Structures are given as structure tokens and as C-alpha cells.
Amino acid sequence: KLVLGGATLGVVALATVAFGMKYTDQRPFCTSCHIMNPVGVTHKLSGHANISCNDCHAPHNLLAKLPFKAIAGARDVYMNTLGHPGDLILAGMETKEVVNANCKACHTMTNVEVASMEAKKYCTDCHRNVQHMRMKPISTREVAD
Amino acid sequence: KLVLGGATLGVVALATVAFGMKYTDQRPFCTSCHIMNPVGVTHKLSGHANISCNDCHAPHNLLAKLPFKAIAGARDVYMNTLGHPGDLILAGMETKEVVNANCKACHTMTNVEVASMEAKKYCTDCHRNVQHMRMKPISTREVAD
Amino acid sequence: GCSDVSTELKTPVYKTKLTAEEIRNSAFKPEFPKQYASYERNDETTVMT
Amino acid sequence: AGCSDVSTELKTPVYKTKLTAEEIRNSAFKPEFPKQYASYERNDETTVMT
Numbered sequence A, B: 001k002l003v004l005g006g007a008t009l010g011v012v013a014l015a016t017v018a019f020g021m022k023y024t025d026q027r028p029f030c031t032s033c034h035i036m037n038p039v040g041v042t043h044k045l046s047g048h049a050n051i052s053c054n055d056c057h058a059p060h061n062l063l064a065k066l067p068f069k070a071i072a073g074a075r076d077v078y079m080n081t082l083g084h085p086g087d088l089i090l091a092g093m094e095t096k097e098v099v100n101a102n103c104k105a106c107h108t109m110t111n112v113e114v115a116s117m118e119a120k121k122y123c124t125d126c127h128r129n130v131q132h133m134r135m136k137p138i139s140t141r142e143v144a145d
Numbered sequence C: 001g002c003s004d005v006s007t008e009l010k011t012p013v014y015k016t017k018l019t020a021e022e023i024r025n026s027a028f029k030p031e032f033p034k035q036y037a038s039y040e041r042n043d044e045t046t047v048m049t
Numbered sequence D: 001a002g003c004s005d006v007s008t009e010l011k012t013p014v015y016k017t018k019l020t021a022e023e024i025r026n027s028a029f030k031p032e033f034p035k036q037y038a039s040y041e042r043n044d045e046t047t048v049m050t
Ligand code: HEC
Pocket: A026, A027, A030, A031, A036, A039, A040, A043, A048, A051, A052, A053, A054, A055, A056, A057, A089, A090, A091, A095, A096, A099, A122, A124, A130, A131, A132, A134
């Protein structure tokens, strides 16, 4: 009953860690910064509204995901406080690769007997609006502030 | 130091229960009984090949899922050992209702503007072959034991 | 953890700005432009099977 | 409790009998295939109408 105190503080420590990793994948957290609002609005309006942000945006492999979350998170907290973001927020080369590998993780079966990885670099070179509905008028995605 | 040894039991006893719960959600575990491999073949051949069996067959909610998996596992083990299954293996009301709720969990956004839950009792009344390709010739699904 | 199923499937419920006796098709077009666009396809009168 | 994935090739069960190349007697198949044979013997029922 004194080593069974560790086996509670231990299961509550891991269950807290686990909840926190999942919470921090999610649209409410991602959009707690007003800069992420337009991407949050287009997510919620789309076919993919019911999967989290990191279902596309971070690796699914656990050993790859934790470090990716920390580094991306660190860049973002920085650019939101001490940096000066441009007028254009565009994904870098690394997120393009992790987003695209996730398309395939979930939609292999539609594509199994076709060379759809070979003509266009990315899936979204054909499925353009899976990229946050980027072809729709500006007022359907964006307000000032 | 008998707390740092009891907290290492709790984070290995939850990491084992967590891994063991996901393992027994999956196709190699389910089809370990040969009575289950027509459903296994048809799962692997389908658009849902890369989601687990229990992504459809059990509640996603963790308080609901644990009891369900145990009760379902108990009766399936009994039927495979001391029971006598018939020539027809069919799902009960219980599993028709959990499978159907899971259709809605992953496919809400397709269906949001339409009364698709109202005419047909189940999603699979229209999406018939999601029910293990049941309309295809027997030889594409089945062999002698 | 949590679900990101933040949007729940619900049978659609409507309350229009129309009177109980409205029968003009054009009166529905503002409320329901998607189904109205579909309905206009019936104007196609060129195609045989 | 179980480990490898299902195969999708649906390999039919394979047999090697003690029968010669040109065996045609029905009773010669009974010893090795009693389930299929007993099912075959159900064709004797000649009373039932639809
Ligand atoms: C949850 C609300 C989010 C948040 C906060 C973001 N996303 Fe996405 N995203 C997807 C794709 C294909 C792209 C383009 C990548 C590429 O160039 O190949 C993006 C891009 C972004 C950006 C910046 C770029 C932009 O176009 O605005 C940002 C800020 C962003 N994401 C955040 C695809 C997806 C998804 C897969 C279907 C999902 C889910 C999300 N995004 C969700 C979110």
C-alpha cells in the first residue's frame, strides 16, 4: 500500500501525458492563436472536419510525432510572440511531406492499382481544396484582426 | 526509492494494457480463428482494409469499449469452443447498432445536409457491400475449412 | 483523450421565411439555391437513352 | 493471442489420396472423404416436394 501509491501516481502521470498529447493535436488548441483561425474555419467546413489537425499535420508514428510536435510548437510560439509573420502563411517543405504521407496512410485503398503518386508530386495537386479551401472567395475564409 | 519503482510498474502496466487493447482490435488477432477469415479476406480486399475491425465493431468511447470487447470476446470464445455455430453467421442487434454509429462517427460530413438516417434504418442498407462484400460470388470470399 | 468529432450528425430541421400557402417555385430559390439549381436541370430536353 | 495477417489469395485446401489415376467407384472415396460422402448420400431422399 506504499508501492501501490506509485502505481497510481504512475497511471495518472501517463494518462495525463496521453490526454495532453491528444488535446494538443486538436482544432480548439491549434486555433487558440487568432493567426490559425482561417485554417481552423476551413477545416471545420470541410470533409475532414472530424479528424484532428495533426491527423494530417504531424507523423502518426509515436517516436517521430513527439519530437515533431515540440519543434513545430516551438517555432510557432516563437513566430507568434517574437517573430513577424508575413502576409502569406505558407507551409514549408517538411509539412508538405508529412501532410502528403498522411493522405496515403488513410486513402491507400482508393489508390492501390493506380500510379497516382507519380504524375503529380502531391495528392493535393489534384485535390486542391483539401488545402484549406484555397480557391474560394476570401470572404468565405477570412475576417480582419 | 520504492516510489520510483512503483511508478515504473504503473507506466508499464498501462503501456501493456494500452498496447494489448489495440492489438486485440485488429485483423491478425480477429482472424486467428479460422471461422473469422471470410470477414478477414473481405476486410483486406475493401476500402476499409487499413482501419481495424473494432473501428467498426466496438464503441470508440473507452468506458463503453472495454466492457464490450470483454463480453464480445467471452461469447465468441465460448461459441468457438463449447458452442455449435450454424451455417449462417450473422450479427446481432447490438452489433448492428454499434457498427452503424461508427459509420456516422467517421462520415458525418458527407451526410450533414441530408436526412440519410431517416429512410433506411442503417447506412449499409444503401452501402450494402461495406457489409463484407456479401453480394459477390461465394468463391471470391470463401473456401472449405 | 478526446474525439475531434466536433460536428455531430443530426437530421436537418428547417424554418423558412415562407407563408403556409406559398406555391411559387421562385419563392423557394433564395432559401434553397442548391436543390433549386438541381431542379433547373429538368430543362434539359436534348438527351435520349 | 494470434499473429500473422490473413492471406487474400483464398488458397483452396489441397489433397493427395490413396486412389489410383482411374478410380471411378463411389465407395472408394468414402474412407478419405466421409463428410462429403454422407452429404452425397442425402440425394437418396425421394419423398419431399416443393
Ligand atoms: C486544424 C484546424 C488545422 C490547422 C490549424 C492547420 N491545418 Fe492544414 N493543410 C493541409 C494541406 C494539404 C496544406 C498545404 C500543405 C502543402 O502545401 O502541401 C495545409 C496547410 C496548412 C497551413 C498553411 C498553408 C495554407 O495553405 O494556409 C496551416 C497554417 C495549417 N495547414 C494548419 C491539409 C490539412 C488536413 C488534411 C486533410 C487537415 C486535417 C488540416 N489541414 C487541418 C489543419
